Design a protein around this nucleic acid. Structure first.
Length: 1209
RNA sequence: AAUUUCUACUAAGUGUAGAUGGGGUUU
RNA sequence: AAACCCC
């Protein structure tokens, strides 16, 4: 099998979460010695200490950058493209680059105390001194010794930036952002000083710092001369925009002073830009994260209650739209609409149809530049267009449409709709509103919130596109000045939406935990026996029960003293030994100056360890290699800590080609799991006294009332301590114990009382009603306090079969005579459909995954998830698409996807098959009641992730595909966009022409039979080779050459005679028989259809209605997929063309056949053809040589597909 | 309507079938 | 605020 070679390929790591149950008096002692109170306190103060840590970071920044008056690069930088230099910004662009770089570098070098800022010292000493509030210092001192909690905070408060770009940087913020708005500072503000009189300037200087001489370089153009870094970002803004002192009168800075010219005297110089404040703090902090939502009264509607500013900007954008007519006068071309999905929507809104704009653009492309390839380049260029000016759209106006004014109508309609829900939300806003049944049961109140939120959100989303791509040249600043102001405040509603939604859609409990340290900052940091007095945590084992023993601070050596009890019971303590990374461990500790004695290495070998000799380059050769290996080998023999711990059976040095062959042995053999015995009695006495704290590592599969297949994470854990595990699964260090407290009360849980019948909810369960002898509660686990043990593991840490997966698959597929492919397609009447084909394209198996059959004991119980979804979708219609119903739908879908992952994994194993899925980064699907793109993307991610280590829970763990020898047939997930060609066994293919194609002929309708005009219909009719009526078979035959029609280059056969066979569902629904209705249209218009070629007679008609109805019957004839929306019984695929044997395909002639040879339905056709597109790719591999198999393009074009389809049959 | 957790459950009576990397860090 | 570090 080809799957068999994909074992031990690469390393992966997982975290297995468990429950820890306090054994014996552990909990009593933990509670008596108050061992979780300081851990909980720390976890509550974590955020507050981080706030104070940031106070120091702010003060650091405002004492370093508030001294940096460097401008050593230039205090002028007057090379700012005023007169584009060096050969039109050739080396001038490089001079602009170097300037930027060096200025940012200056501002960024390790500043005045960069060491004690992001290390332990800040919490230890710096922060306590800086702070002057006893309680604040107390919080900081409660984190002494436990400053490892702030590691990621430290690596984002410093290490998010460095000497680079990105908004995270403070220098980027100061140079590559703030000097951009300060580059407008030497050209014409003094010419705009007509309004800014002498008395005005002096008035505002007497209001701001009088020490500040004037207003200086301010808001003009060209270069800079005063600020550079931060010279009072707020001071600048105080007079750029406006500030209020203590006077009360809003001291117009200079922006309102410009408005005197713009309003009192009506001029058109615009307003100026305020300096971006250093991101809240300087680089981070949080503004609109506005949290606290835990009660039904927190946040209190930040849409018009807490934030009336959101309502204020509805009026702001309303004004902007009425001002659209005057923005015409000042740059209507300047208003751009971002090209994207919104452009199609805006086309429908302004003109009529969604494609108007696209067609008008393609038409211009068709003036200068209809082949398949041609259209690819057309779209490529359209996508590249970043935005469309409003004037460009007025030119693309088909007729007399004023784009700008039409837009104005649309936006005013939208703002009025917001106001409609504002009228309906007055009660919610009232201060005297009363919450009756919570906010998780008051679906009327929830609806009020949702509806208003949606109205606001929709307006905001529509107005978003009116910005453009961002970097345009002409951009009316009189629009794009106040627009950006208002839209930034509107964008805040996405937060409020999500927050209110998440409170309503929350689970009734909490999953909030806190890390426990047991007064040991190095708690459970590893499992090393040598550091059992530092980690103070070990895994014990009695029988099949596994335990977590934690030594007390005072009694850390307690378990090291306990010996076995030959006669009595015995706990087995783990002896965990691991050499962590020989490639670094050995060099570090053996070349060291400490080790410059026992096996002293010389400075030449120290430079081998330094320069880069032993690592890589052309310096690495056998000299250093073998010498170092032998030195390491023998210094390991001189190291009792590594020699007695692991008997390192090595091979000869000559065999070792590189040092890595040697290091592989030191990793494989440098790991041991053993189990030494300890008297159970003594261990239990330690637990009684409080000297040891034992917990049972537990999941429901560790119950004695548990009988079936264990969870795979339980098997992984149990095999960590197994004898057949030889390092395949290792226990990585880094385990954490947490404590999730109770969130629900036991008395308030929904009980199903004892000895009372409980209805069974699966309709396909032969048993309804259950009756238990005990009570069953809802969410029992969250009504009690739980300890959570999170244990990291390492699968395949020493990979042995290292190859490129993608290439190896291609090579194996090229040499497989019968390669099977599993095509999976999301359908309309099916959630997912699976068609497995073989090497020749013969359907070996076709079935829907609507129902999932679980196999417990020997019984198989089916669960139709499609019916479950239908029920939940009816519950989404009732309760007007509320948040909860859609989350229930999404959770059901995610859970269904988990079951399907298993089903697909089994098919891979059964058929040694490659999977064929849809590239979701290309075309679209309709409203298939099924996985939508989001859930199908999650499915593909989960499928990749499962196939990174594919294991069957019901196989012998030491067999291929068993827990210790799983299949790594895909590569690690990177991105959703990286799922586009091959991931290993998964091939992603485009799904164009896979469903609406005839499986037996390959026929696709490439005709556009939508009625346009009488003349176009005559052109259509006469473009046919013959439109006659065959009287023998009673079928009108329409012979066609596709070459006589447009955009049909993809077709291979080109010559197809269509026939009016059978019935079509005209969804207007009606089952129209085509022959009959053609006859009827002809008889209605008095056309003798029995007169041979009737093409000319059809063209001799003149009534537009004949043409429209011939066109509609034409459309229907070419409809292969015919399905009634509602009645699910009726759904089929019917061919207009006959095959070689003279038969038209009907899916209805296959749905009954158990082993159909052609698709049974339309959803089966999709999956069949998805798998046949990969079969094409396998034939492409088969034609190429093995060295260039990785270069074989697996992307099918519609032309090559249609050739394959039309010529394989 | 029980769960390391999630989804579906009751699935044979305190559970069943699958899946399940955690922890910081970002408005 | 999607992907970003360490496991």
């Amino acid at each position: 099998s080809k799957l068999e070679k994909f074992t031990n390929c690469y390393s992966l790591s997982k975290t297995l979460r468990f429950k820890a149950i306090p054994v014996g008096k552990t909990q009593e002692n933990i509670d008596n010695k108050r061992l979780l109170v300081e851990d909980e306190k720390r976890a509550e103060d974590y955020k507050g200490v981080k706030k104070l840590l940031d106070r120091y970071y702010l003060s650091f920044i405002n004492d370093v950058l508030h001294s940096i008056k460097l401008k050593n690069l230039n205090n002028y930088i007057s090379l700012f493209r005023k007169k584009t230099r060096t050969e039109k910004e050739n080396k001038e662009l490089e001079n602009l680059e170097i300037n930027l770089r060096k200025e940012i570098a200056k501002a960024f070098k390790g500043n005045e105390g960069y060491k004690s800022l992001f290390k332990k010292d800040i919490i230890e000493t710096i922060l306590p001194e800086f702070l002057d509030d006893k309680d604040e210092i107390a919080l900081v001192n409660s984190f002494n010794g436990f400053t490892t909690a702030f590691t990621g905070f430290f690596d984002n408060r410093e290490n998010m930036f460095s000497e680079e770009a990105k908004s995270t940087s403070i220098a980027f913020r100061c140079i590559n952002e703030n000097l951009t708005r300060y580059i407008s500072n030497m050209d014409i503000f003094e010419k705009v000083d007509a309004i800014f009189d002498k008395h005005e300037v002096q008035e505002i200087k007497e209001k701001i710092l009088n020490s500040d001489y004037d207003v200086e370089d301010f808001f003009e153009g060209e270069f800079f001369n005063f600020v550079l870094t931060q010279e009072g970002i707020d001071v600048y803004n105080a007079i750029i925009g406006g500030f209020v002192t203590e006077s009360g009168e809003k001291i117009k800075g200079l922006n309102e002073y410009i408005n005197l010219y713009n309003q009192k005297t009506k001029q058109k110089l615009p307003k100026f830009k305020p300096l971006y404040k250093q991101v809240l703090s300087d680089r981070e902090s949080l503004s609109f994260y506005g949290e606290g939502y835990t009660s039904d009264e927190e946040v209190l509607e930040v849409f018009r209650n807490t934030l009336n500013k959101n309502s204020e900007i509805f009026s702001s954008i309303k004004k902007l739209e009425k001002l659209f007519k005057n923005f015409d006068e000042y740059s209507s071309a300047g208003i751009f609409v971002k090209n994207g999905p919104a452009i199609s929507t805006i086309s429908k809104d302004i003109f009529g149809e969604w494609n108007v704009i696209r067609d008008k653009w393609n038409a211009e492309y068709d003036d200068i530049h209809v082949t398949e390839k041609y259209e690819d380049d057309r779209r490529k260029s359209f996508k590249k267009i970043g935005s469309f000016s409003l004037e460009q759209l007025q030119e693309y106006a088909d007729a007399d449409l004023s784009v700008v004014e039409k837009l104005k109508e649309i936006i005013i309609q939208k703002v009025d709709e917001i106001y409609k829900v504002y009228g309906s939300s007055e009660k919610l806003f009232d201060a005297d509103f009363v919450l009756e049944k919570s906010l998780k049961k008051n679906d009327a109140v929830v609806a009020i919130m949702k509806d208003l939120l949606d109205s606001v959100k929709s307006f905001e989303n529509y107005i978003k596109a009116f910005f453009g791509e961002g970097k345009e040249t002409n951009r009316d600043e009189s629009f794009y000045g106040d627009f950006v102001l208002a839209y930034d405040i509107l964008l805040k509603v996405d937060h409020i939406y999500d927050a209110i939604r998440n409170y309503v859609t929350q689970k009734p409990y909490s999953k909030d935990k806190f890390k426990l340290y047991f007064q040991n900052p190095q708690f459970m940091g590893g499992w090393d026996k040598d550091k059992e007095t530092d980690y103070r945590a070990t895994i014990l084992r009695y029988g099949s029960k596994y335990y977590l023993a934690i030594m007390d601070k005072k009694y850390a050596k307690c378990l090291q003293k306990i010996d076995k009890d030959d006669v009595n019971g015995n706990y087995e303590k783990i002896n965990y030994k691991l050499l962590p990374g020989p490639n670094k461990m050995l060099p570090k500790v053996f070349f060291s100056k400490k080790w410059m004695a026992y096996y002293n290495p010389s400075e030449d070998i120290q430079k081998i360890y330094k320069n880069g000799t032993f690592k890589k380059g052309d310096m690495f050769n056998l000299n250093d290699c073998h010498k170092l290996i032998d030195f390491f080998k023998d210094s390991i023999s001189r190291y009792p800590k590594w020699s007695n711990a692991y008997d390192f059976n090595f091979s000869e040095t000559e065999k070792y080609k590189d040092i890595a062959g040697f290091y592989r042995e030191v990793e494989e053999q440098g790991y041991k799991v053993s189990f030494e015995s300890a008297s159970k009695k003594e261990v239990d006495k330690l637990v009684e006294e409080g000297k040891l704290y034992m917990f049972q590592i537990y999941n429901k599969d560790f119950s004695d009332k548990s009988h079936g297949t264990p969870n795979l994470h339980t098997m992984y854990f149990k095999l960590l301590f197994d004898e057949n595990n030889h390092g395949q699964i290792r226990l990585s260090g880094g385990a954490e114990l947490f404590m999730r407290r109770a969130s629900l009360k036991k008395e308030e849980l929904v009980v199903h009382p004892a000895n009372s019948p409980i209805a069974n909810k699966n309709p396909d369960n032969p048993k309804k009603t259950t009756t238990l002898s005990y009570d069953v509660y809802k969410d029992k686990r969250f009504s009690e306090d739980q300890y959570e043990l999170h244990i990291p593991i390492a699968i395949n840490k020493c990979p042995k079969n290292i190859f490129k997966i993608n290439t190896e698959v291609r090579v194996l597929l090229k040499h497989d005579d019968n390669p099977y492919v599993i095509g999976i397609d999301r359908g309309e009447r099916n959630l997912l459909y699976i068609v497995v084909v073989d090497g020749k394209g013969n359907i070996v198996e076709q079935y829907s995954l609507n129902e999932i059959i679980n196999n417990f004991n020997g019984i198989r119980i089916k669960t139709d998830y499609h019916s479950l979804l239908d029920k939940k979708e009816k519950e989404r219609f009732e309760a007007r698409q509320n948040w909860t119903s859609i989350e229930n739908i999404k959770e059901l879908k995610a859970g269904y996807i988990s079951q399907v992952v298993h089903k697909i994994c089994e098919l891979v194993e059964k058929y040694d098959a490659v999977i064929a899925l849809e590239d979701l980064n290309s075309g679209f699907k309709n409203s298939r009641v099924k996985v939508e793109k989001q859930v199908y993307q999650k499915f593909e991610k989960m499928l990749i992730d499962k196939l990174n280590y594919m294991v069957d829970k019901k196989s012998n763990p030491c067999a291929t595909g068993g827990a210790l020898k799983g299949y790594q047939i895909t590569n690690k997930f990177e991105s959703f966009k990286s799922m586009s060609t091959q991931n290993g066994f998964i091939f992603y293919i485009p799904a164009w022409l896979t469903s609406k194609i005839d499986p037996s002929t390959g026929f696709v309708n490439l005709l556009k039979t939508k009625y346009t005009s009488i003349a176009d219909s005559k052109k259509f009719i006469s473009s046919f080779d013959r439109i006659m009526y065959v009287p023998e078979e009673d079928l009108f035959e329409f012979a066609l050459d596709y070459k006589n029609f447009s955009r049909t280059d993809a077709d291979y056969i080109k010559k197809w005679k269509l026939y009016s066979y059978g019935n079509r569902i005209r969804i207007f629904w009606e089952e129209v028989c085509l022959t009959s209705a053609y006859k009827e249209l002809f008889n209605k218009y008095g056309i003798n259809y029995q007169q041979g070629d009737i093409r000319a007679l059809l063209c001799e008609q003149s009534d537009k209605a004949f043409y429209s109805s011939f066109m509609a019957l034409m459309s229907l004839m070419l409809q292969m997929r015919n399905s009634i929306t509602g009645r699910t019984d009726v759904d089929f695929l019917i061919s207009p063309v006959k095959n070689s044997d003279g038969i038209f395909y009907d899916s209805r002639n296959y749905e009954a056949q158990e082993n159909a040879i052609l698709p049974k339905n339309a959803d089966a056709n999709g999956a069949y053809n998805i798998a046949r597109k990969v079969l094409w790719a396998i034939g492409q591999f088969k034609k190429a040589e093995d060295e260039k198999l990785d270069k074989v393009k697996i992307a099918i074009s519609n032309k090559e597909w249609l050739e394959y389809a039309q010529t394989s049959v």
